[PDB]
Amino acid sequence: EYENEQAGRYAARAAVRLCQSIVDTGTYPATELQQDLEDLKELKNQASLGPSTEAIVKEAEARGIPWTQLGARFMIQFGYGVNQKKIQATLSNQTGILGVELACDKEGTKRILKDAGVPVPRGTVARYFDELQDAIEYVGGYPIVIKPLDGNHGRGITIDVKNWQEAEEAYDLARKASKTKTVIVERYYTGKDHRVLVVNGKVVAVAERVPAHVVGNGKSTIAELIEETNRDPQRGDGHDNILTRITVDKSALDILGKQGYSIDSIPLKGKKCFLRATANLSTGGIAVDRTDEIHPENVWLLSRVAKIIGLDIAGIDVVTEDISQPLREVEGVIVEVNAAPGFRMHVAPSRGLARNVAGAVMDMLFPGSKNGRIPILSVTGTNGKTTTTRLLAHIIKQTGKVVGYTTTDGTYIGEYLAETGDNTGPQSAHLILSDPTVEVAVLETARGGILRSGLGFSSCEVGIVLNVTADHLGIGDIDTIEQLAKLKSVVAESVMPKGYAVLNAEDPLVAAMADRVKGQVAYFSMDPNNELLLRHTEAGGLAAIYENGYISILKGDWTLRIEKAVNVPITMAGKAPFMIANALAACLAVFTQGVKIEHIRKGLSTFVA
Amino acid sequence: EYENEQAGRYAARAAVRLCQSIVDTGTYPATELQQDLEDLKELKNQASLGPSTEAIVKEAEARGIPWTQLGARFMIQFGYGVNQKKIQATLSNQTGILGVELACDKEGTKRILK
Amino acid sequence: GFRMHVAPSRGLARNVAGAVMDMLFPGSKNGRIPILSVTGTNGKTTTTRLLAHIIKQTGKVVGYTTTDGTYIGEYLAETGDNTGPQSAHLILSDPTVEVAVLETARGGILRSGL
Amino acid sequence: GFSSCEVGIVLNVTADHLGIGDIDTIEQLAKLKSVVAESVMPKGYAVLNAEDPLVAAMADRVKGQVAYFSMDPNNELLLRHTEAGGLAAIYENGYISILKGDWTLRIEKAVNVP
């Protein structure tokens, strides 16, 4: 058993080498063992997804929704056929280009939000020095924030200035950093900052950010809290854990020096003393859950903002004195909107209740108690797989559905050929199930695919087993007909509880698969006097027989005749008895899915080989 | 009547100046007239959309569907309230981020199509 | 771009804009919502508020603008607003408004029109 | 009066009044009250009180899912049921909370309920 393909193969290759080295020398060097272990760890880390992706994948697996990994851009596809959805990290196939592009433009989104009445921080553009004073009149005085018009990742932007000389030097620095000599000055808003997550137009979680700080509640200074904090298991490196190690950098040391306290200075009255002012969880900030104590008007406003920008999943930054009051009484503003936010901060608040963000996302993708599954019919057997598969496809084509079917001849999507030189393994199944237009999948499953790579799907709605004959043996580890029966039993065993297993009652080996099969069992037989079939029909039903020149279906105590068995072109007026079994199997499989009798008749009369 | 707001205001401001210059001197210099005409042409060209946008806007107007110009990124909004749609040049609000990003990656789209 | 298809220079032109507009609005439908414009000398505000309250009884989101302020359904959107085209644009651009009720004063008609 | 019910709620069983009919023992009363819990369809739910041992003993011989409600948030049976499964309700810190497995959903402050 393995969890990662490359890691599993490497471990398998290394085990035999280790055993050979032991039997050759009596012991294995420790350095080689450590090399192998670190190589395994590197392999495991390499084939790993971003934490949001594992969260969503685990949530999907908890609901029984199939998921596959596309090879293009680390995209994950949920579902099959026309019911599939795609996610990358948090962006879905429904997320718009226009909304994402607008969110990346700060001035554009600010102007859009201002036109809709949403409170936004006041600001003004200026290009000449003498105009700055006038701008100070518009913003309302001090303090102010200086930023350049064209800049990414905060190039040359100050945080807080409260007098004339610092404002002048910050403006000069920004102008020397600005590419167009023009600078926006905006009113600095003080207050607690919150990060609100909006999914499908509804607020899911609200988190309050507190800047990285220390508290002297234990009557101790930083010299001991540095080791005290290291004992918490949450601390670590990377970008997967919310609690990162406290990096005492030169900038942070200068900030705490100008903060107004010293290394040995005890906090006054027992107040938190901050180490940085960025208020970031990656830096080492603290999240607080405030989902419950939010005013309904604020929720309505945030939902309106998310709908106005045009983002299904959005992260809004708010600055307010209190989140339990409307943003009008307090001087609250909307700072920025992010199109692809991470929710690692909301899953582990570290103070409060955790919120199920992955559940909300999965509910948005699949609204009701529905999964992205499509009808699947897997046909296996020794002799007549191809004809049965083609007959099933032709019969289902009579209904207005697009049918994708794979067989020995080639892979077909509806009416037009998709692949000529294809195999009947998992590759063709993946090709069929990934098409955005296929509604019903019909797959011929040969034993070679099962032995080499196994089945390409977790479960099937209909599993047909025609017959098992030991006409060819000696391949692989299959040397006995019992082994072949066990190999063919995989299709029957991998049937969901609401599915059907269509088995041949005449063959004792195939009929022995009645047990260890979840879901209903339907028998088809060329002999209408089979004891097992009659016993099954008397208590239950759903069998198919060939009684008096007729293809009949027994639904218990009732008999439904389909065709005269001589009007079917493939039977050649009944001269070929082998094709009648395939016709019986196909008709029974189609009937188990609810297709009307007249459709089956029309499909059977028209189909040609 | 005007077709462009800035062009119309400029023409209105220029007409009275031209008439005052005529009644003051008896004629208007040709260089100033050419300057005003080229300024009007520049104003008309400045407040113009990409040809796809005029095509779609004309088609929408032929069907009596209201259209407005948003001030963010040259986006055009059709309709009112819950029945509105947005287009930039040919991208709609229904166009996905994933599809656009995949189309820009040649190797990724080739591997997907294969 | 579809400028190449509109003017093939050899063959028949194709209506790409028509196809795009059909994709945006499938049937013979437009992006219009119910609009009620109230004008008068004396009782515009009371009539507008009464209309909004009556329509609110039906399960619809109503956006209405009057002298007091611009309201989107139940929650106040703008306190210090005018009854001109600006409030109308604010009402009609909201992605949740289904019925618009607007008080139209003569000042807005004289200054900027409807 | 019905063959099956979608939701069957059993609050508590106390032997405050006995001697009627053939019900003279609290076990007989528990068996009589167990009819509602037992007559629940496989897709239904049985809402039982985890604090009462007699009511909690009805966990077996019941078709369909079982949901426990308790006034004590430290009940061992409720926590064990939530760890493997979920759908319980508790009163933890002045809150009416619902446990859906590893998640807690708070409803009311328990003092705003009249």
Author numbering:
A (entry chain C): 115 to 723
B (entry chain D): 115 to 228
C (entry chain D): 456 to 569
D (entry chain B): 570 to 683
Authors' account:
Cyanophycin, a nonribosomally synthesized polypeptide consisting of equimolar amounts of aspartate and arginine as the backbone and branched sidechain, respectively, was first identified in cyanobacteria in the form of opaque and light-scattering cytoplasmic granules. The biosynthesis of cyanophycin is achieved by a single enzyme named cyanophycin synthetase (CphA1) that catalyzes peptide elongation coupled with ATP hydrolysis. The discrete active sites of the G and M domains are used for extending the Asp backbone and attaching the Arg sidechain, respectively.
In the apo state, Glid adopts an open conformation and is the furthest away from Gcore. On the other hand, the sidechain position of Phe692 in the apo form inhibits ATP binding but not the interaction between Mcore and Mlid. Mlid is not well resolved in the apo- and ATPγS-bound states, suggesting the mobile nature of Mlid. In the apo and ATPγS-bound states, a large density was observed between two Glid modules and over the binding site of (β-Asp-Arg)4 (arrowhead). CphA1 is known to synthesize cyanophycin in E. coli cells; hence, cyanophycin is the most likely candidate for the molecule with increased density.
